Amino acid sequence: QFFTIENTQQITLLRTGDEFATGTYYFDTNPVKLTHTWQTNRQLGQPPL
Amino acid sequence: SYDNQTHYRFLGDGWVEITALATRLVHLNMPKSENYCRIRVHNTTDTSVKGNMAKDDAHEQIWTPWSLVDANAWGVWLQPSDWQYICNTMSQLNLVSLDQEIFNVVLKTVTEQDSGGQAIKIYNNDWTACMMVAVDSNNILPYTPAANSMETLGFYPWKPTIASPYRYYFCVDRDLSVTYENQEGTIEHNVMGTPKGMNSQFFTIENTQQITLLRTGDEFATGTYYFDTNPVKLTHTWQTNRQLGQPPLLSTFPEADTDAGTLTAQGSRHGATQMEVNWVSEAIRTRPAQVGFCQPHNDFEASRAGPFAAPKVPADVTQGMDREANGSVRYSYGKQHGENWAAHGPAPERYTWDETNFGSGRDTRDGFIQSAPLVVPPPLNGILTNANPIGTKNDIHFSNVFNSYGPLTTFSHPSPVYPQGQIWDKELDLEHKPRLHITAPFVCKNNAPGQMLVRLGPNLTDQYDPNGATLSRIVTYGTFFWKGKLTMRAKLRANTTWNPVYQVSVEDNGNSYMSVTKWLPTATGNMQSVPLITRPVARNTY
């Protein structure tokens, strides 16, 4: 598989006074917790009486 | 209005709205520890031994002056007979909603008078006194299943019950080394530990829930939690990787009802396998997937908390009687949660439940593994069996360390046990959840039923000084009723076989496991609750 930047994307020429801007990609991901756990198979539920 | 029944509302297409009505008198005493206690527990009496370490009970829980009220146990809602009716007719079940209520709060105080006669105890209620109730609806405080220690509520209606004091775990970082029988040397270090600043979590009923005071003529009622769970089948499978699809073609037909038929030459027989052999056979033929799997036997792992038995998915015990191989469970209840009442000594009755999802279990004896391009009669060093010692140990074979889990590994969800058995269970706040829980059949996909806590109001005396070490408080205790509503959805199975199917029936007074006398009172009124078969009717996996 030999790809080529030229035969895959629409290149855009930018000179001195030019400028480019992308769209606005929207992320579709799952959030990540900002806390740590500690409990283990020993600390799970009703502790011994 | 007291009520403890079970209504079956029939709908169309074979769907039923099962309603559970449970009412029960409760008893509560003054929580001895007027304040939260961060007590530790170390059983050096056993951890010091060389062979002992599987008896490790080291940790550091936190005792709260509150008592939890958990009714998470089938044996408290449904009636023995009812469970039968269900398992014999239904084909699946699922939780719908929950609803709880409290009322008829009675608060009495005791006065041990008569010091000039003997020593009698006088009783008399107090209205001004108050009870305290709150509901962890948001589930802030750690989850504590009462059935996770058989401390739920009574399973017998006409018999009151008490609540199990609330207490949760805390971070400590225990440690213990490995040792066998006698071995040689010392147990290295069996250290306990101190609290870390990153994992320290001390909650307080007061700064987490909106407590509500209830006097004599007061009463409380909860909302109506709606269950969001997945239904569980009420039937058992049997098929194995041998009975999956098109059975081999027959070339020979029996002459009488004695002899059997034959197949086609293994070599000259159509089909497809994953081996390089130029023949076919049931044992090697390709199958849709994997029915059950091999699990490491007695796998004890250890983290900062210490050693523990790695849970294993329950399955069929198989002809090999391999219980601790297919994760069968052994319970230890007592009086309220079953067991005969005429049983002496504190000795708790036990029972080992063997899953009925046949075809998913495994027999270690026959379990083996060949090598390289499969050979018809395997050599000696070209096939490892459950008789070959691993790592210089005679009793340790590949079985006790082999994990056959994988993509094609499909199985059946464990069926619940009538009495004792747990109903639902909160889900772990982990980014990646586990395919299921063994503690209970139903797991709340979203938030779970807020736990209910109770506590008697600290009734003080005339002499009170906060700065004073430990001071008195008028003796008090209370009782109140608890009404619970549990609605569920289920569909009646369909009779499609022909041959009568297995039903959960009882039997005349005999030695049979299903003896009527087992669920009947005695000359004095004693009785027990023996676990009952779930999934009496066979299903069909493929």
Whole-Å CA distances, B338 to B75, B156, B332, B335, B390: 9, 9, 10, 5, 43
* Distance separating alpha carbons of residues B77 and B73, to the nearest angstrom: 7
**Residue whose C-alpha is closest to residue B204's, from B70, B71, B63, B69:** B63
Q: With an 8 Å Cβ cutoff, are B303 and A39 in contact?
A: no
**Residue whose C-alpha is closest to residue B306's, from B197, B172, B169:** B172
* Distance separating alpha carbons of residues B525 and B516, to the nearest angstrom: 15
Q: Which two tokens mark B275?
A: 């081996």
* Secondary structure of B382-405 in HEC code, one letter for each residue: CEECCCCCECCECCCCHHHHCCCC
Which residues share a beta bridge with B10?
B16
Q: Give me the long-range contacts of B365-373 (CB less than 8 A, separation at least 24).
A: B365/B320, B366/B320, B367/B294, B367/B399, B369/B398, B373/B276
For strands B451-456 and B329-333, give the pairing. Answer: unpaired
Pick among B69, B144, B169, B420 to test the A interface (most A CBs inside 10 A)? B169
Nearest CB to A40: which of B149, B170, B303? B303
Which residues share a beta bridge with A7?
none
CA-based angle B191:B193:B197, to the nearest 5?
155
Nearest CB to B168: which of A37, A41, A47? A47
* Secondary structure of B158-175 in HEC code, one letter for each residue: CCCEECEEEEECCCCCCC
Given a contact cutoff of 8 angstroms between Cβ atoms, the answer to whether B489 and B93 are in contact is yes
Nearest CA in chain A to B149: A46
Kind and range of the H or E run holding B77: helix B74-77
Whole-Å CA distances, B234 to B17, B219, B352: 16, 38, 20
The DSSP result for B290-302, as a single string, is EES----TT-EEE
Query: What is the number of other CB atoms lying within 10 angstroms of the CB of residue B493?
Result: 18
Which residues share a beta bridge with B349?
B333
**Residue whose C-alpha is closest to residue B64's, from B137, B200, B169, B213:** B169
Given a contact cutoff of 8 angstroms between Cβ atoms, the answer to whether B433 and B52 are in contact is no
- DSSP state for residue B316 in the 8-state scheme: B
Pick among A40, A46, A49 to test the B interface (most B CBs inside 10 A)? A46
Kind and range of the H or E run holding B455: strand B451-456
The DSSP result for B36-72, as a single string, is -B---B--HHHHTSSS--TT---B--EEEEEEE----
**Is B340 annotated as belonging to a binding site?**
no
For strands B122-125 and B220-221, give the pairing. Answer: unpaired
- DSSP state for residue B289 in the 8-state scheme: S
Q: Which two tokens mark B136?
A: 């962890």
Given a contact cutoff of 8 angstroms between Cβ atoms, the answer to whether B62 and B167 are in contact is yes
**A 25-44: CB under 8 A from B:** 30, 32-33, 36-44
Given a contact cutoff of 8 angstroms between Cβ atoms, the answer to whether B196 and B173 are in contact is yes
Given a contact cutoff of 8 angstroms between Cβ atoms, the answer to whether B96 and B442 are in contact is no
Rounded to 5 degrees, what are φ and ψ at B48? -75, -30
Give resolution in angstroms.
4.2
Instruction: Name every residue whose Cβ is closer than 8 Å to that of residue B326 and which is 6 or more positions away in sequence.
Output: B295, B312, B314, B315, B316, B317, B318, B354, B355, B361, B362
B152 in A contact zone (CB under 8 Å): no
